[PDB]
Amino acid sequence: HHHLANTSAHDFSYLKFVYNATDTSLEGSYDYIVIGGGTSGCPLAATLSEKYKVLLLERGTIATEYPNTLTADGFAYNLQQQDDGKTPVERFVSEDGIDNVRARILGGTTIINAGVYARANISFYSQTGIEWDLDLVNKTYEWVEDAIVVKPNNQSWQSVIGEGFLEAGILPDNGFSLDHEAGTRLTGSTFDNNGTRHAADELLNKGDPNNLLVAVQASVEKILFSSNLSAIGVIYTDSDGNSHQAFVRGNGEVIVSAGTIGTPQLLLLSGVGPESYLSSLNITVVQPNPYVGQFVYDNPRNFINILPPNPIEASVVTVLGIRSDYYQVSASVLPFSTPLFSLFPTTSYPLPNSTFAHIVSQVPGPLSHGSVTLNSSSDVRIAPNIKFNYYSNSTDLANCVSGMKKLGDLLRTKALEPYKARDVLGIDGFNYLGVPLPDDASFETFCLDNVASYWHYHGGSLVGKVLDDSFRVMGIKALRVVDASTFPYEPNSHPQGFYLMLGRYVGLQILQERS
Ligand SMILES: Cc1cc2nc3c(=O)[nH]c(=O)nc-3n(C[C@H](O)[C@H](O)[C@H](O)COP(=O)(O)OP(=O)(O)OC[C@H]3O[C@@H](n4cnc5c(N)ncnc54)[C@H](O)[C@@H]3O)c2cc1C
Ligand SMILES: *[C@@H]1O[C@H](CO)[C@@H](O)[C@H](O)[C@H]1NC(C)=O
Ligand SMILES: *[C@@H]1O[C@H](CO)[C@@H](O)[C@H](O)[C@H]1NC(C)=O
Ligand SMILES: *[C@@H]1O[C@H](CO)[C@@H](O)[C@H](O)[C@H]1NC(C)=O
Ligand SMILES: *[C@@H]1O[C@H](CO)[C@@H](O)[C@H](O)[C@H]1NC(C)=O
Ligand SMILES: *[C@@H]1O[C@H](CO)[C@@H](O)[C@H](O)[C@H]1NC(C)=O
Ligand SMILES: *[C@@H]1O[C@H](CO)[C@@H](O)[C@H](O)[C@H]1NC(C)=O
Ligand SMILES: CC1(C)OCc2cc(C=O)ccc2O1
Numbered sequence: 001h002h003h004l005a006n007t008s009a010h011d012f013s014y015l016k017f018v019y020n021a022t023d024t025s026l027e028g029s030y031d032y033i034v035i036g037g038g039t040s041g042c043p044l045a046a047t048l049s050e051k052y053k054v055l056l057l058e059r060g061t062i063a064t065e066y067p068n069t070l071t072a073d074g075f076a077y078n079l080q081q082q083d084d085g086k087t088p089v090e091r092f093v094s095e096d097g098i099d100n101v102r103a104r105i106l107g108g109t110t111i112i113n114a115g116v117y118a119r120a121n122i123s124f125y126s127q128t129g130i131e132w133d134l135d136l137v138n139k140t141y142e143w144v145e146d147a148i149v150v151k152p153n154n155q156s157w158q159s160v161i162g163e164g165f166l167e168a169g170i171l172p173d174n175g176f177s178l179d180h181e182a183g184t185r186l187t188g189s190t191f192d193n194n195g196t197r198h199a200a201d202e203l204l205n206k207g208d209p210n211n212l213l214v215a216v217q218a219s220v221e222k223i224l225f226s227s228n229l230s231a232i233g234v235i236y237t238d239s240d241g242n243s244h245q246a247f248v249r250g251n252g253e254v255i256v257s258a259g260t261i262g263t264p265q266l267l268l269l270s271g272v273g274p275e276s277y278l279s280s281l282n283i284t285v286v287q288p289n290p291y292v293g294q295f296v297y298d299n300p301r302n303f304i305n306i307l308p309p310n311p312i313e314a315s316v317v318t319v320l321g322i323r324s325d326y327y328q329v330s331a332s333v334l335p336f337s338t339p340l341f342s343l344f345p346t347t348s349y350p351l352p353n354s355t356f357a358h359i360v361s362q363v364p365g366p367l368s369h370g371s372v373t374l375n376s377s378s379d380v381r382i383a384p385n386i387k388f389n390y391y392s393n394s395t396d397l398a399n400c401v402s403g404m405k406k407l408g409d410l411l412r413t414k415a416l417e418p419y420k421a422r423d424v425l426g427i428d429g430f431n432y433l434g435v436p437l438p439d440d441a442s443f444e445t446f447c448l449d450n451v452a453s454y455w456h457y458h459g460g461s462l463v464g465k466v467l468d469d470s471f472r473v474m475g476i477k478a479l480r481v482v483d484a485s486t487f488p489y490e491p492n493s494h495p496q497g498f499y500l501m502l503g504r505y506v507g508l509q510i511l512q513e514r515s
Helices: 013-017 041-048 075-080 124-128 134-148 156-167 200-206 259-269 275-280 394-411 440-449 496-514
Strands: 018-020 028-035 054-058 089-093 099-103 173-176 183-186 212-216 219-225 231-237 243-256 294-297 300-306 319-323 326-333 356-362 370-373 385-387 479-481
Touching (some): 013 018, 013 200, 041 054, 041 496, 099 259, 134 200, 134 496, 156 183, 156 326, 156 356, 156 394, 219 259, 243 259, 243 496, 300 440, 319 394, 326 394, 356 394, 394 440
Parallel strands (some): 018 212, 173 183
Antiparallel strands (some): 089 099, 183 319, 219 231, 231 243, 319 326, 370 385
């Protein structure tokens, strides 16, 4: 952990090569175009720029425009803020009826998230069947961590929860570790010890400023193809609504890094997707693939909220309780009168009047899946439909049962006993905001009725379905996808670490292949 970042201001040096998409001089040929300046997109573009001319296209603006994105304290503000179409948080509702958000900003979801940093479960690599260069994976983790990851300071609530998890039998004590392993640990954070947010945008600082150009408020509308099927370029619109073209040249490539929602949307809009679905919308099929926008996953979040009789200190999540069937954390939260959109699954949820502990469990996988479909066959700014089918798979429900029973165990610990309003023997001694924990039937109803998004959604452009083991779109030359659309299961409890790593790792695979 010699390599970890220090406390330091958010580094915006890269703004020297960030331009408004209104600049027509950006139009032309590049070696690489990366669509979406997010978690995977930024480190991929920075890596490619070491040797090649790169255009990164991001639909959102720069984080300096929304200062509440740059601190731990600002986290709530971004979810409370109304979505006017320009804000870094884009609000949506799944067809399941569950409120949710995605990022719309340079840096992607790393600019709005809860900061928790972990490496992938070391078993993930062989699970995929991809021939990963495991030494390069680990060096690439250190390259991310060196830039943006700290060892968090002590926070009283995280220490309480950590003692609780251990007392509740989530063993062993792993101390401070970045690794996803069974047991309780302090993990890394992309919030520094001063509360400054560090994010994927800062990895642009590792790019070559002579080779990397970033266009912001660049809404990529279509992938352009040859007339040997190859991606050749993009159409993108600017904030005034004027259109622009950029192309790749020679052995160059287009990479889509537009996220679980944005990637399948743009593939479908560009005629890459299920023949009968695109034909039904009169979208000309460039490449039939029955799986674009299929196998879209949202790991369930289930939770209780306790209202201690004495104030607790607010904390960022740093302490994790990991089993193979559930991943658990808790945030301590200040009261608010404006709700944090998607913290609770609907807008009709009680407001807290005092500090509360949000105590949560995450279902692994999950095994339930749904799909992304177009709402508009022409306009990328119109959000696609998304459905996750929470708990349609009974293994997911069985796992939520186990998780909720373990949160029961946690509330019974000596660790949590001081946070009860009444010194009675049972967990009815706590005061709850919303529904308290309840044989399995009542745990099942609790799981089904009170599910929220963990925000760790993934899928829609899966390796083995749409992509090969090199992240290439099967049947198309010069087109890759690198982002959370690529895997049907989580790499770990907190996937930003994996997707930051993946952007640079695939960039290095691209540079090697080209040698
Ligand atoms: C509120 C919240 C909290 C979270 N907390 C954590 C946590 O603490 N730790 C953790 O590990 N994970 C966390 N996650 C999950 C994790 O951050 C995400 O899974 C991950 O960042 C996704 O990376 P991505 O590259 O797939 O997408 P993104 O990072 O969202 O990148 C996609 C980018 O593409 C852009 N875009 C989309 N369509 C287009 C288009 N057509 N043209 C141009 N640009 C486009 C978007 O604006 C965006 O910037 C959280 C998620 C949320 C929503
Ligand atoms: C780009 O320029 C337009 C005016 O042409 C302006 O409205 C918009 O805010 C600018 N966006 C950025 C990111 O500078
Ligand atoms: C990669 O790092 C992990 C710790 O994150 C370690 O368990 C593993 O042995 C390393 N693998 C290789 C091939 O070095
Ligand atoms: C597609 O176009 C045909 C005309 O060629 C029309 O009959 C059909 O209704 C159209 N479908 C859609 C969904 O636009
Ligand atoms: C790590 O990954 C493998 C799935 O490949 C799994 O068998 C194991 O449960 C996972 N462990 C944890 C603690 O998530
Ligand atoms: C577009 O979005 C709304 C959800 O807000 C939905 O009711 C409507 O039917 C959608 N249109 C299509 C074609 O899916
Ligand atoms: C759940 O998931 C697996 C696919 O992984 C499948 O075998 C099983 O049939 C599904 N279960 C239910 C209850 O649908
Ligand atoms: C938003 C708030 C209140 O603080 C951060 C937070 C983070 C996780 C991530 O594992 C889950 C829940 C949560 O709650």
